[PDB]
């Protein structure tokens, strides 16, 4: 089986990276090399092979990834992350039924600090006829992924009616997105005007409110 | 170019049956062992079988040892994955993914289809828009999208302006409300200025129920 070490990697532009993995026993094949491989899969995509054969780098794959390892520990080593690196890493191993992969090592992207756009939709008449209206709450474009949303009616605290949908990191900018939520059935919406949603982010020094008028029409 | 393409799955209730299959493209099919891989809802990955060239070689895991069977025509460049009582740990994403001749599993991986297992039933989701009338408009761009509420099974498919807005494209993972249907929104940045000319539309499409729908969205 396998072991991969570290879960999470933060790494900066420019540095290296070091993932390893651990098979429970010596894997080796009919001596026809150790049949451990790594694997990359960005977000939204199917995983890719990057090293095979513990060292041999897959066609297409850049240099600045390598393999190497012995016995049971195996490492693969990025010497300088770039932008497109981001994403989660699993070793295989292929020596040994049943073939076994590790758990994986999310590597993510750290960069300068950014300030997420909040923002605030009011539910459409379209689905308040239908009755239950949801007023979402987008925390467009920020880092670290560290946001605190606060639901504020009038100036109530509700603890209940929202969820959160928090993207993956995006190379285009390395930053992360959010979405909250708020599920209400007409009635409750229908009761208050003002609706706000509450901002708290580590590049945010003063938490950001964001409220609406409610209305129809 | 060398490509695979599964299909066949969708919502299957426990102890069910289903045959997913994977159609090769760009190389000699009849040359490789083929593979299939699954990934669970926590991303966990798995290997789930393989079968040599002649097809009367093949493996699998205990886990799904008995219940599934791979097998290929090699006369149609198809590889098949039997799913025979289906358990709801059998839920996952399955690819179909061939290796090389040098020493290598998984060199080319397909797009995947997903397979449900539940009791749970089939809903059409219901494509709202967002409205950004004016508590958004920062300035200069403003933020705008559909609201894909209450479907099940996943996936459900968003697009905008068919593919003629790609970029600024934020379109979230869905989540599993209480009601047991799934919810997700996709959210798209734009300038104030494009308003009126550029026509935005979100093209929602949930298979799983043949539901194809449009949606044009405005200031
Ligand atoms: C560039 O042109 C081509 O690539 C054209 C295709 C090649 C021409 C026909 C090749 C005919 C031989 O095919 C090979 O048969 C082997 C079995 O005899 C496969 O290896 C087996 O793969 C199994 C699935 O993973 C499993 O790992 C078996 O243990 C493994 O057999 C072992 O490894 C062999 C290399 C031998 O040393 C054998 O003694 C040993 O038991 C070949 O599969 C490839 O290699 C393995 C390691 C794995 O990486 C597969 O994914 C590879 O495809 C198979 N060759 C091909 C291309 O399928």
């Known amino acids: 089986l396998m072991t991969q070490i570290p879960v999470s990697l933060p790494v900066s532009l420019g540095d290296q990276a070091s993932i390893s993995c651990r098979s429970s026993?010596?894997?080796?094949?009919?001596?026809?090399?150790?049949?451990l491989e790594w694997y990359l899969q960005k977000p939204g995509q199917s995983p890719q092979l990057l090293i095979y054969?513990?060292?041999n780098r897959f066609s297409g794959v850049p240099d600045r990834f390598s393999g190497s390892g012995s016995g049971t520990d195996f490492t693969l080593k990025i010497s300088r992350v770039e932008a497109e690196d981001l994403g989660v890493y699993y070793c295989?191993?292929?020596?040994?039924?049943?073939?076994?992969f590790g758990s994986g090592t999310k590597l993510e992207i750290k960069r300068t600090v950014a300030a997420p756009s909040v923002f605030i939709f009011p539910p459409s008449d379209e689905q308040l006829k239908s009755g239950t209206a949801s007023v979402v709450c987008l925390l467009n474009n920020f880092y670290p992924r560290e946001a605190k949303v606060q639901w504020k009616v009038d100036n109530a605290l509700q603890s209940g009616n929202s969820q959160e949908s928090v993207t993956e990191q995006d190379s285009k900018d390395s930053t992360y997105s959010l979405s909250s939520t708020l599920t209400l059935s007409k009635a409750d919406y229908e009761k208050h005007k003002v609706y706000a949603c509450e901002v708290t982010h580590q590049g945010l020094s003063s938490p950001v409110t964001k409220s609406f008028n409610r209305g129809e029409c | 170019e060398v490509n695979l393409v599964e299909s066949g799955g969708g919502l299957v209730q426990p102890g069910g049956s289903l045959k997913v299959s994977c159609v090769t493209s760009?190389?000699?099919?009849?040359?490789?062992?083929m593979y299939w891989v699954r990934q669970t809802p926590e991303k966990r990955l798995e290997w789930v079988a393989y079968?040599?060239?002649?097809?009367?070689?093949?493996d699998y895991p205990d886990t799904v040892k008995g219940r599934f069977t791979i097998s290929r025509d090699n006369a149609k460049n198809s590889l098949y994955l039997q799913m025979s009582r289906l358990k709801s740990e059998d839920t996952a994403m399955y690819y179909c993914?061939?290796?090389?001749?040098?020493?290598?599993?998984?060199?080319?991986w397909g797009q995947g289809t997903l397979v449900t297992v539940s009791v749970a039933s089939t809903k059409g989701p219901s494509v709202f828009p967002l409205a950004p009338s004016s508590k958004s408009t920062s300035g200069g761009t403003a933020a705008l999208g559909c609201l894909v509420k209450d479907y099940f099974p996943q996936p459900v498919t968003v697009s905008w302006n068919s593919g003629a807005l790609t970029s600024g494209v934020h379109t979230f993972p869905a989540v599993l409300q209480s009601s047991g249907l799934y919810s997700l929104s996709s959210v798209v940045t734009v300038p104030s200025s494009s308003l009126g000319t550029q026509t935005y539309i979100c093209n929602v499409n949930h298979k799983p129920s043949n539901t194809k729908v449009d949606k044009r969205v405005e200031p």
């Open positions: 993914a061939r290796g090389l001749d040098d020493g290598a599993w998984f060199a080319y």
């Open positions: 760009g190389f000699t099919f009849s040359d490789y062992y």
């Open positions: 079968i040599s060239q002649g097809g009367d070689i093949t």
């Open positions: 026993q010596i894997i080796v094949h009919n001596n026809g090399n150790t049949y």
């Open positions: 054969k513990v060292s």
């Open positions: 295989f191993q292929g020596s040994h039924v049943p073939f076994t």
